[model samples]
Target chain A: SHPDLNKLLELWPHIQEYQDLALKHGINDIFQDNGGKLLQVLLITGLTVLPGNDAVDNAGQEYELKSINIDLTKGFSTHHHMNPVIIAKYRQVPWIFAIYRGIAIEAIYRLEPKDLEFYYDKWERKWYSDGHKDINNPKIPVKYVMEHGTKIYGSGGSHPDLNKLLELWPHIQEYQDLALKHGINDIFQDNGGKLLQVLLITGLTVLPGGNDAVDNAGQEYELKSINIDLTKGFSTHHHMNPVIIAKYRQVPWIFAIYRGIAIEAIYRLEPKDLEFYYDKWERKWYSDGHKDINNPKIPVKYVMEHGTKIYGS
Target chain B: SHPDLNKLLELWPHIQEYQDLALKHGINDIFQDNGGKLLQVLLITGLTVLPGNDAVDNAGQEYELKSINIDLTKGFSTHHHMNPVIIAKYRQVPWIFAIYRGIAIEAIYRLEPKDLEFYYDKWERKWYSDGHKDINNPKIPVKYVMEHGTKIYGSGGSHPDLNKLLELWPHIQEYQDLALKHGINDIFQDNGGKLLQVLLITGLTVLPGNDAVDNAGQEYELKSINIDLTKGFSTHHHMNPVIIAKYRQVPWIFAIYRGIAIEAIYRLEPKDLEFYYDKWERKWYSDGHKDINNPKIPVKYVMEHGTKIYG
Candidate 1:
């Protein structure tokens, strides 16, 4: 506990500096204000702050500077159609500073230039009009279709879609829990296609006997033989599983199909498919345009085997 | 530990009963037996057992015929499927049961009457024969594609693209570790896609937060706001990332793209895509048709996003 406390205290100076910078520049607000653009960096190869960098002259204490160097050195000068990636390579420390430390700084030590009346009035307006009922929609927006399908059914929304929705409201939390347990509740989030790949990759090694053999069409289908599975697994894991990144490549769409089905089954909603094609050698691009009408057919049509592993709709 | 052992000891009588049943039955070869064709009761709704009654009850107990209630008064009967799932569920239990119980049942057992020499010997012979060095021209038949993939890539096989080959093995491992730190790695193996839907639903509740009010493609679309990047910081929790599953759905033709890359990366041997797919998915499925040309693409074309993310 002493060492832990000392560690916390040692980083106090750097934390304070970052906090000052954030307050002056309002980085949190900047991230918040920007619609869908934020900074992401390929830190492993591009950044100076690597595993061995712990010995690189108190680099952890100087994360902000390391991030800048990393951005300049190896990272691509631009990302996502020429958009820039802000290389935050100070490790988790800088990230924590940008977020948690900023929160603390906002809470104490500084006073807002605006009067208390203005703050209260602003809070009152948001609470009475926009903030309090911030999330009352029964359906998910078209753009936010990546999370695991919670809204499509009901629990994540302001109102339920069940015929027995009113009856279930008293036990809503329990209902959600049971639905999840019984394969009737789901949560869909961003870049989940890549995450599923990582998860399956980990499961191949982590399962009871380190067996990647999943129940496929009532038989054991080992996970390793298919070269693409390994290749995609490795690629997604190495890359951040970014949605745009996956869009540029096509396999993630296949992965997304499977993920959506399992999620919809668990959530008791219809699953949907988002299809796109990118062929390098043949030079082709295609989009099926987010098919949600035929949920039963949901990606099961494409699979040669393992269609009955957990999905049997 | 003692209580666990004691519980097992208490069940020994049941085990002995089942052991006797196996000996009495005509079951001998457990290895080469068709587990799929043997089991029956999986279809039964209430309390039916499979293969033999012993198949369901793993503890191996004496089945007592207490009462054959003539339900004439109740008039109850059941209809079996015209085409039953005729998989041999019985052959699977011996190996599974032995493995489960940690019992020395194998020494006491003998191969069934007609299956002794050919079945057991053939099963043992393949282990020593090195697995097909070339999956394309597999020395042995690829009875199971999933198993073959599992044998080669370890856990990486969960991904269903072709860019990973040996060239990106290290970086893949590194990105995996980073994602783990962020807690975005495990997207619920069972039903992650549904979770994605939930997050999306929740995100929709607070949408206009990213108040970028226009589409770039619109000619007369007057926008109220500039492009905003609000969605990025909203989900600090890592589970919000997009997740996908590729356990067994990838068609074998897709495997050709990856195999060439992997064989090339690991062995520096680039497979002819035209010949490979023609031989594998097309030829294996083609039977005798000789008109199909190389229509398969390479891994480089398949793994573009991967190059961006982890690379």
Candidate 2:
């Protein structure tokens, strides 16, 4: 069933019941095609049922809650960092800010001949060719590397150790169009337009609705809030559920986490802290070489222990 | 009349007659609304009447000409570096390459108070402002410069000596819309897109003709020749006609210098040499430092003596 605040409240009281069902499903490998169902179940228990700390700071002055309505039907696939962004900015309703990272079904494909020609050495773990070169080997020359090394992956490269690549060129346009159709993509992936998005989002001083709450002219005072559905682990072989859950610790956010089981978690972050973490994480992923292998981890065990626990994973 | 190959060939014989008429129109300030008229007249003379040495290189074999049909009716105003590029790429039919620098009227205006509050100090010629105290003397801060300085001239900073700015914020959208209307604005001002433009243009091996030229794949073997018009001088004001004449050094160019004014100035330029000089002359004016002080020099006498005159 689709999520409503009323339904969410109703299920909020039985959070443990839903958590067990999701966990059992995961254990039995029933999560193969249940992404949507898992998301709805988590939304009721995690977002509406849980009472987050009041949007306040140390001094006790109440901070306003910004409303950001997320459209989950679009922007999910094809890691062209800009695709999600263009969807968010031009197609979706304006938002104070939006995070474009989301779950998708990542699939694997065989290495094509051209890919195998110049890149086979890298797969064999050889960085240079001196001892390895047959001199006639197509894989040893710098010319071969320059021409084929990066182009093999197109824009969305493969995972380092994986034999599989992300979406190939022939299907990229189709994938992007479908993601837009569903609103399930992360427009802010790789932080392509995040800088401008944050600039516009920060310019707002108040939430909308009051007579005194005027629009920020020349400034984008769009939506407020964030969205994430945990059911969206990468396709069958490689899952993103755990990694996404771990990254949640860095930001003050409202999200649904589920692989087999799910829960909603919300953190009321200080504005200063929010800015610092957002900037930090964005750079960590977007900036080359500065990326950390283990960053902003919120352990799965910690979430199951206190994450509206009715059971343990 | 709009130009076509047939009409261009028709006016080929009356070259001397057209040159005199164009010269008279320029002197009497009659050149104001005749930019299109002037272009047609020169096309016949410079292109057809005066034969450019067949597109040939150092080798005796004939080399192919690449066609880049320019529409001067659009992309004339605005300083943004990308404006010319968008025009060349989108509005016009695809060319091997096209140069976006040309002549147009330049005007000035006073800096508004907001401009002063934020950007006044740059006018004082201080690249860096000292203290923020008394900030009243209108030394615009770095923030103002950061946000609006480079944006002022889309290509780069203009001469501080120049009095007015290009399209201010309020009218900028309208100006951009109009420039896009005809696709004739100066996209290559300050030689913004010339590098890439020349890069692509030089890569073309042949020009296209109708009936199954079937657009050249991966390699662009399109057309057999190039076309240029000489009458494309000043749209308004007494422009540097001779300067424009001097700048018309390219494959298959059509220019109306004059019976005496015209220069049979052809060069067997290397593709590398072609890139350098095209870049050099375009920057001489667009880069602002070498902008001509006497923008309008007729130079009839200057040309008659030295510009390829045969007894």
Candidate 3:
């Protein structure tokens, strides 16, 4: 678990889906439990994510897991499953603790049965079984409990990329609410594309000197948003001149489509083959000069039929 | 104003934005006051929608208007503007009434001076002019008052298209909350794109017969949402065969791009020029045979650069 946990932090964005949904909404329904395990399961060689418990049951069945919510005020919610048989089955397996904060897992720890032992109800003068519903057994503080358990992963909690965005989403919703009120009726207005570019990539910064913005990955991305319903088509407005080809051919251009404030879809134009291919791999590039239709005002139909949709309605 | 109010009902969706956000979220920030006036101003020739009243001020400034929310139990909230001068100015201009129900306007009525006249307070034995905050003056019953006033616009009210979708959004939110719990983890999962197609258009009906679904416009739309982040690309997996070319060529294809369900954006492949074009308007049509590359797997960048986004 430690080997994969540490390795996953670096391999996160490579797992296709992580680049799409996980990065945007911080959604992880892929595992079914909705316990936020994708980040931990990515590098794990063998993983299926059981429908019931969110333990790691590899082909070898080496390690087990339990997701615990951390509330600083009340310590961790470590009391549940009052049934004796259920507790026995859980204790029979080695459980690694995944601490959840907000929606992302911040840290991972391993707890032995002794660490979660039965506690004494001082006022009642009775000893209660570990994790008894009647009593808040093992209500040990997070800082003190971590002292006993071995810290396998997460030097410090929080997935750097996702944690910021999940926390930033609600704040953006508030900004959007206010934006609509101010007659920001369209996302294609003036520098509207730049503004949405700001929302999608939390780490992007607008530079009037040349390129649109840079992504969290530290790479350059040209940003633009269009009103598909109104424009009837999205275009470069001119042919791919030497300057146009130079700027766009190399950098990935992210074009966000929207009519009003509600975005319909997001698409990316990558370098060659897919976004800007050289030959028959694509015709949109060379054909721009064929029609002389303003670097060819691209028909919306072709884009939808061929483009890789990053996000949609 | 009356002639256009009734006529706008059919033209509501043609206005475009009303087709996009208005259809899905029931958002009406199109007007600054947020009083929901798009239905009223559509056919009113030469209308600027001044910072002033919500009235029919066709270059002629013929009518000044105000929006009043309708509460069946409490009657109309017809009390405001304590200043007589402001009331005098509004009354000077013909004020046609627009009554709001939920987010849509349910009915429109015209009120006259005599209809909004001052009332003698029986308890205080004092006379209070119309719309006095001191008391809920002129709080007349909606049914009884409409009897005397002229009914120019809004036969039954409600933008039939937007009203239903706005009401449906909250209900869908509840459904989505439950969907994520049962493993609707990915939009590309089997039949997953079909489910999202249901959310975009309220009137769509999925027929296993062939076409994905039909829009509120009564036209067929092939609905498909993909994971651009994971697929490393989106593809038909096969070249532009006879089946794909014919079925997709004519009808609009709405391919939704998403990794999760927040709906990052939506794009539409239309019939021609805009979505689907004949030959030179686009290369995606004939290039299917060039490389023998599975009708060519389109680069994500190409789609983003081109695509027509019809809601």
Candidate 4:
């Protein structure tokens, strides 16, 4: 998608400055999918990172992903057995070095693999950091990724945007820490659910509606959220008649799972594909919701397989 | 409509800072609509200024409209012949004194006209400024509206937001002056139409869609803009077979009429009510589009009757 990068840049500060929850959504959603779908995140940039663990250009050219903490690094992997396979698959692909500075994702860059030419010897059939005995996913220096790479995001002195946002994170974090007390949903019930909805909208293209589900372009998204547990399942409104059913089938849902302030994972489902009924055992309405065309399970597995890992493992 | 006033506060800056066409949209969209309908402008605040020439609270209490430029004022109108009817209708309504600082709409306030109790002479049956022979719609002092009225919008230490935006107005205004020459559409064809579209999007509740019509809640809006002339009419893509026709019928359109950069009027029409056909004389597709349930046309009249005045 040819996303509006300028709108994305302008909106980024707003999300970071959000007062409700301390959200470090999907590694800033610039490179990570996380809750970006909620913020129209998919349409924020020219870049598209797939679930396959790599990013692609508008031309469909693939770029390998190598992540670092403070280290803006990227060195190809060398396995005792898979090295040949790795070399073939990654042949001429460019490498994208991501710098996750913890406080913020400070930098991201794309560099041709040819930048590693001097570090590799053809006859040796190995990268310089490759060790035959004890293999490792070694690091590359920031210089190569910086000097030779094209800037994808930031390295802005020290990230003023993130610094200010996190300044309130601790204060907001306690709103969650106390969730461990009295009742989790109780403290959250009033403005609790509303705050999470704000986070969801921040990463999506859709605008907020009072009773109506939001639309992005012509596509519809009915948002739902659940706390800490998934196997316990999610519920719909008590009285589901034809009107509610019609809306459910017409609009797709994005189920966000959160624990305190962090959204652990996000799942998607088409209501038309599932069956819904009242559960007397639970005294609630439940759905046999599957996470997309690719079916995965027990809510958590469905998330692991088809959902985006936003906050949790 | 419970508009989002805070969001309007946040968005006002962006509109003023807009670089392309210097827009003072409908007297700052805070009190005047000009084009606020486009910015999701409808959703940006808790206030709704209606076609009734007044404002209302969520409770539906009506307020009167009094306008000024550096002259924040409100006084009951006296016709010499019609003063009795004016007093009856305006009996106990809140008067809204709107301050048009020119550079920006500096302030908007809701002051109870009852605040004028001190200035009224009960048996005299006339407001303080109501002249017996020489009638005038006189000005209200700023102290009452500012110090006594509920602050609806600015004063903001003299409009830092509007000051910066108008800084580029003269430069942007020239783009229109040049439009007066070598064909208006030619310069506008490239970035011209697009920039107007940006302004339209700024004041509307709907987001931009590449091909699809935008939706506010479940309502849909397909935007179109034209310049200087409305009698000239508007046209659509030549190929109006079936698929395009289907989209046309489904989405409502908001047609904007601009004189260079300022939008004079805006109109809305539901296409389901219209029948489309190719016009040989015009060399394009045409429609019998009705502006809502109301029927007015030649474009300008339709906009005048059915559309919002949003420039």
Candidate 5:
């Protein structure tokens, strides 16, 4: 299965920039059932230039993502919950302070800054957090099972008492305004028949593989399900490997071992940098502890940080 | 027949060298019948050089003939019976002497004693008697006639008088020797069988209209006396006029006419200029009886002796 891995790479030079390019160098492409078939998922990566590399940072820059998700969750539930915290913190911190604050990078250097200010009395981090994040992206496979399970086990589901209903009351309230703006004022609020009419028409059209009908005479089936047996109605075997691979390829999502850079708390960095440290600390509840696979807490003090590596060989 | 005489002359501009261009000028196109259908004769004169000012002559000289007669007998006999007597009488004599000689050229000036002495003693007069006799020139239309008539007259007659048949004759007589030395030994002798053969082989194999006979079935009826009418004979009554018209468009010989020089002869001023004037008298069989065409002897000469014309 792993035969000619180097051969394939030699033929297509563009495979070098892929996220799992190093891992694919030793990966096997053979399957057990087929006598001989090539299963090399050779990805060709084409990188656009990084967004913030040459950006001037003097605290008055106003930039906008095409679309933003502002999460009101207390601890991290998804990467969307942790990314803004990481930005808000360490923005005004000097480069050295940012290293003390970077969870994985702090372990590599012995620099902790406290009560420090440049000529303008402004904070500037030695190593910008953004650059380090690009080095190691999260390549955690089977993340869904580890993520949801970790959260419920970490702090008992954020609101374990009413977990089945409202996870965050204020978030639900914000959704009302958002829904009204989106002309989706009818969330679970409509006549059953009219709602199903919109759902059947729009929902059935959205999924990729198309809805499949079970019995010829029965109603339409959604693309996400299949009838295995009459007793078990519709169960779709979800595929998460490609999703993890894709997530590992995104910018600013690093994963490192040894809980390095989690000790940035000892430094007296900017409030924003301190805020980024604490925000990453809170995200540990969602990070399933295979240590290297999850986005760990930002260790605020310097120590030795283990380097990040690709997920599979 | 003369509808486009000038039109024919217009082609003279493209005439090449070695062309006796002005030989046939005012002749009718010989075609056939009295309707001019079948060609039998042609009339020629000097109009061939009409396309040029006179370039193709010696130092821009323009030579024109006054009359040309294509002989039906003796093949290519000149119009004048003897051409030498005029030349023998007066080449170096004054203008009238040459005119009185009635040769092909007319002199226009007087000459002194030294000239008369030069003429009488030195310049050879033999050319006048014997120059062009050996010139092998075929009567071109005869071959064309026989070729076409072979289809009309057929190959099966008493063989006709095919023995004396020859086209162009040799000049040095050595060219005739070469023909005899080769395997073609019938150089001086004529073969009657060969004439019949050449006639049948080349006769109108592809002529259209009345002369055409695809096989033997459509052979034309000959209106000959005691006509068998069955020898594949067919001839156009008007083809002669067309052939004559074409012949008149080309020149194969030269003709010249001179006047104002004949007066010198009746009054023989320089009898030494009269080398062989008797030859001229023998030509017309004239005893100087009123001088042939004009009948009256000419009066002016070289601004002195005579106005005698010869053609």
Candidate 6:
């Protein structure tokens, strides 16, 4: 009835450190028959954190059983002695770390030194800070890494573009903020978690068979989920800067990828008395990406650092 | 029953010379009860040739009775002793001549000297000619009257502009050539002469009412006539120079009026320190004409020269 549970349980010791923290936060159901579907989330978050080149051992064989177990438990923890409610919705650090890796990389590479600093409020909601964070502060300021560090991610919102962004991803971005505050684990741990997890996991992570694609075919599936109704809820903000907020959101992952690609594209530019290497980068990201379908996309570095070749491909 | 026929016959003596010529050309039915409707053609043609300022006598009262007779045969001629069949269908010189007054005035103002000379090929159909006509030739060369006389009427045909012209005068320009090849008189003579005369007379001469307007109410009336079917028959030519042909046609009268207006427009130009006056006329005829509603249209000079102060 549960063929993979044994295989998944065998590799649990390797990531055993996460169990206490995850159980403390209430995510206790990874090993149960009813919680089988959580394996997909584990698989995606586990692969997102492991280093890509070392995912396979020197022998070049995939540690398939260990990989499946790590994938299931990477973002979760469970403990037999803990109360079921407390252990049922624990949020592990790896997945949060992976998500923040993308955010910081974007902040360092894409924002101005002034706009790069941010700190959590007393409520732990992220807010943009004017001054760079100092050594005394737990929040470290993101510094410019290279010449391409000036790139903006989801930054520009001249009225029409912002209006379009609002119309397209109204509720998705709002929900991302809500999930960030409430904890994704708690939100997905409820009675309807199965259907909700399937809906979100499909979009955020590439699963086998193109299941998460929110294209023409997935439209029906999208309607079946409450997220669709939620996504259509709000008007896009005129004054709100989307770039900083976009770092924490998942739906417009393309925005982060585009800026990431823009950096690599600029770095690839070798000096051959080039007056307009910057000009070409501007056009490739701003123009070609919009006009050409087969344009190259930026790789998600967090996905690669985590023992995966897919950069959210 | 017919009031205007008695008035028109009184003016027949003044234009008595055209009756034999009209009869010889196969128009014979003008003076009968059956021909009572033909009085409109006489009215418009007659008044077109009369001196308009002289239309009122010394008393400053309108010679209303004489004016009706003049309007009835204003552009025609007549004589006695002709074939009953031939006289019944005779296409009079007045309507043809009044139509040609518009034609020649357009040619004088619109066509280049090279395209202006043409003689009938014994068929009375105008054709384009090359050489300036000799004294012996019945055809006369159109001499350039001024620097502005070299303008071409409705003479452009780039695909886009031609498409625009097509949208503007979709039927009128197309029918001109059709009627040119197959005589317009013959086309209108059978059963349709009354409706045809009213249509042409309204456009040719302004009636007391908006009778000739091919607007919404007459849409069904227009469809009942053969002219309606013929109007919708063919697509406009993308290559044909519509302005010169439009001069001979009644609708889309802008081709002739524009060139004539262009001449007055050019003359209104002054020499010393004139900045805005010339500029205003240019815009009133060209630019403002396009942009503004109720834009002023220059009158057809041929309609005025034949004794009409109203133009």
- For all predicted structures, in order, the TM-scores are 0.16, 0.16, 0.24, 0.25, 0.12, 0.14
| CAPRI level of candidate 5 | incorrect
Which of the CAPRI classes, incorrect, acceptable, medium or high, describes model 3? incorrect
Residues A221-263 of candidate 5: C-alpha lDDT, one tens digit per residue? 3221111121122122222222333332222222211111010
Residue A271 accuracy (lDDT) in model 5:
30
Quote the lDDT for B311 in model 4: 35
Q: How would you encode candidate 6's per-residue C-alpha lDDT over A74-120 as one tens digit per residue?
A: 22122323332321222211111111221111121222323322221
What interface RMSD does every candidate have?
A: 21.5, 35.9, 22.4, 13.9, 51.1, 47.0
Q: Per-residue error at A200 for model 6, in Å?
A: 50
User: How many residue pairs clash in model 2?
Assistant: 40
* Best of the two (2, 4) by lDDT: 4
Each candidate structure's count of clashing pairs: 80, 40, 25, 28, 75, 56
lDDT of each: 0.22, 0.26, 0.42, 0.41, 0.22, 0.25
Give the TM-score comparing model 4 with the true structure, all chains together: 0.25
Better of 4 and 5 by lDDT: 4
Rank list by lDDT: 3, 4, 2, 6, 1, 5
lDDT of 4 by residue, A145-239 (tens): 78878876423322344455445445334433332222223222232422333333334443443332444455656655655542445555554
TM-score for chain A in each prediction: 0.19, 0.22, 0.34, 0.36, 0.16, 0.16
**Highest DockQ model number:** 4
Query: Model 2: per-residue lDDT, tens digit, A5-118?
Result: 233344333333433343322212112223223223222212111112212211222211111112342221211332223322322221111111233222111222344332
Which residue runs of candidate 2 sit more than 4 Å off their true CA positions? A1-118, A121-126, A130-183, A186-261, A264-313, B1-311
Candidate 4: Cα lDDT at A196: 35
Error of 3 at B66 (Å): 3.8
Worst 10 residues of 3 chain A by lDDT: A1-10
Error of 6 at B151 (Å): 22
What stretches of model 6 exceed 4 Å from their correct place?
A1-313, B1-76, B79-171, B181-311
